Amino acid sequence: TLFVALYDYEAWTEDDLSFHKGEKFQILNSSEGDWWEARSLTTGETGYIPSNYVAPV
């Protein structure tokens, strides 16, 4: 149940997580819709990400 970025995403607000294509994520929440709370396995930093920007491994 681990995911990987398909595109780069530059966040505007601090509640969102910026990431680069080829970044790895642990999904912390999928219940609140299509923005997911996730943790960057590269920085450890948590934040919201657009689910359509990631794909299962």
């Binding site: 595109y7 780069d8 995403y9 505007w12 607000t13 601090e14 509640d15 819709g33 299509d34 923005w35 657009p50 689910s51 359509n52 920007y53």
Partner: protein, 106 residues
């Protein structure tokens, strides 16, 4: 604007405040003349990049200063009709538009 569309999400008070400050810091909106066309373009950009449905940036009718309906959006439109976008942090604490024009919240 060539980055794939992010999913929809509701504009909240918090998102509106964060967004206001983000745009203030980036700069460009402060002291920009307001056309409805310019408003729409901004809304679409924010919609495409941030997923907020473009129905949150409505202001109070003229004449004079134009106040934001969405509490937390800290921009209003200032005469000299010729309008400019103008930041006002007060709008995060006082919901002016609901005070002056209560008829948009019923």
């Amino acid at each position: 604007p060539v980055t794939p569309q992010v999913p929809l999400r509701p504009m909240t008070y918090k998102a509106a405040v964060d967004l206001s400050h983000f745009l203030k810091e980036k700069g460009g909106l402060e002291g920009l003349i307001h056309s409805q066309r310019r408003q729409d373009i901004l809304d679409l950009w924010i919609y495409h990049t941030q997923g907020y449905f473009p129905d949150w940036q409505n202001y109070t009718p003229g004449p004079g200063v134009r106040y934001p309906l969405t509490f937390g959006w800290c921009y209003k439109l200032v005469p000299v009709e010729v309008l400019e976008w103008r930041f006002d942090s007060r709008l995060a604490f006082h919901h002016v538009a609901r005070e002056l024009h209560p008829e948009y919240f019923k």
